[PDB]
Amino acid sequence: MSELEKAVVALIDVFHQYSGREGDKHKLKKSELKELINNELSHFLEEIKEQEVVDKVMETLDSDGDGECDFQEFMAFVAMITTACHEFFE
Protein backbone atom coordinates (compact mmCIF):
# COMPACT_ATOMS: atom_id res chain seq x y z
CA MET A 1 0.00 0.00 0.00
CA SER A 2 1.04 3.59 -0.73
CA GLU A 3 1.01 6.24 1.98
CA LEU A 4 -2.18 7.63 0.48
CA GLU A 5 -3.96 4.26 0.36
CA LYS A 6 -2.92 3.67 3.96
CA ALA A 7 -4.36 7.12 4.74
CA VAL A 8 -7.75 6.24 3.19
CA VAL A 9 -7.96 2.92 5.06
CA ALA A 10 -6.98 4.63 8.30
CA LEU A 11 -9.77 7.23 7.86
CA ILE A 12 -12.34 4.51 7.29
CA ASP A 13 -10.89 2.47 10.17
CA VAL A 14 -10.95 5.24 12.82
CA PHE A 15 -14.47 6.23 11.80
CA HIS A 16 -15.54 2.60 12.18
CA GLN A 17 -13.87 2.28 15.60
CA TYR A 18 -15.85 5.16 17.01
CA SER A 19 -19.17 4.84 15.13
CA GLY A 20 -19.77 1.15 15.90
CA ARG A 21 -19.66 1.64 19.67
CA GLU A 22 -23.24 2.70 20.42
CA GLY A 23 -26.56 3.10 18.66
CA ASP A 24 -26.30 3.48 14.91
CA LYS A 25 -23.01 1.64 14.28
CA HIS A 26 -22.44 3.69 11.10
CA LYS A 27 -22.87 7.14 12.71
CA LEU A 28 -21.04 9.18 15.37
CA LYS A 29 -23.31 10.38 18.18
CA LYS A 30 -21.97 13.19 20.42
CA SER A 31 -20.15 10.94 22.92
CA GLU A 32 -18.48 8.95 20.15
CA LEU A 33 -17.36 12.09 18.29
CA LYS A 34 -16.04 13.56 21.55
CA GLU A 35 -14.03 10.41 22.21
CA LEU A 36 -12.69 10.35 18.64
CA ILE A 37 -11.48 13.92 18.87
CA ASN A 38 -10.04 13.54 22.39
CA ASN A 39 -8.23 10.24 21.69
CA GLU A 40 -7.23 10.60 18.00
CA LEU A 41 -6.64 14.34 17.47
CA SER A 42 -5.00 15.16 20.81
CA HIS A 43 -2.09 16.84 18.98
CA PHE A 44 -4.18 18.93 16.55
CA LEU A 45 -7.25 19.92 18.53
CA GLU A 46 -7.83 21.15 22.06
CA GLU A 47 -9.30 18.44 24.25
CA ILE A 48 -13.09 18.80 24.58
CA LYS A 49 -14.20 18.96 28.23
CA GLU A 50 -17.43 21.00 28.07
CA GLN A 51 -20.85 19.94 26.77
CA GLU A 52 -21.12 23.35 25.09
CA VAL A 53 -18.12 22.45 22.90
CA VAL A 54 -19.35 18.93 22.05
CA ASP A 55 -22.68 20.50 21.05
CA LYS A 56 -21.09 23.27 18.98
CA VAL A 57 -18.82 20.79 17.15
CA MET A 58 -21.70 18.40 16.45
CA GLU A 59 -23.91 21.26 15.28
CA THR A 60 -21.16 22.44 12.90
CA LEU A 61 -20.59 18.96 11.43
CA ASP A 62 -24.25 17.86 11.28
CA SER A 63 -25.20 18.90 7.75
CA ASP A 64 -28.35 16.78 7.41
CA GLY A 65 -29.55 17.63 10.92
CA ASP A 66 -30.07 14.07 12.23
CA GLY A 67 -28.13 14.88 15.44
CA GLU A 68 -25.22 12.58 14.54
CA CYS A 69 -22.11 12.71 12.32
CA ASP A 70 -22.19 10.24 9.40
CA PHE A 71 -19.24 9.18 7.23
CA GLN A 72 -19.68 12.04 4.78
CA GLU A 73 -19.98 14.67 7.48
CA PHE A 74 -16.94 13.06 9.06
CA MET A 75 -14.99 13.39 5.74
CA ALA A 76 -16.10 17.03 5.63
CA PHE A 77 -14.61 17.37 9.13
CA VAL A 78 -11.33 15.71 8.03
CA ALA A 79 -11.17 18.06 5.04
CA MET A 80 -11.64 21.12 7.29
CA ILE A 81 -8.77 19.99 9.53
CA THR A 82 -6.42 18.88 6.77
CA THR A 83 -7.07 22.04 4.75
CA ALA A 84 -6.46 24.26 7.78
CA CYS A 85 -3.17 22.45 8.50
CA HIS A 86 -2.18 22.78 4.82
CA GLU A 87 -2.92 26.51 4.59
CA PHE A 88 -1.13 26.93 7.92
CA PHE A 89 2.11 25.49 6.51
CA GLU A 90 2.61 27.69 3.41
Ligand X SMILES: *c1c(O)c(OC)c(OC)c(O)c1[C@@H](CC)c1ccccc1
Q: Which residues line the annotated binding site for Ca(2+)?
A: 19, 22, 24, 62, 64, 66, 68, 73
- CB-count exposure of residue 33 (10 Å: 0-12, 13-18, 19+): buried
Question: What minimum distance in Å lies between the beta carbon of 57 and Ca ion?
Answer: 12
Contacts for 49 with CB less than 8 Å, ≥ 6 apart: none
Residues paired with 78 in a beta bridge: none
Interface with its own copies includes 7 (CB under 8 A)? Answer: yes
Binding residues for Zn(2+): 16, 26, 86
Task: Specify which residues 5 forms β-bridges with.
Answer: none
Q: Which is nearer to its own copies, 38 or 54 (CB)?
A: 38
Task: Considering only residues 42 through 71, tell me which ones interact with ligand X, judged by CB under 6 A.
Answer: 44-45
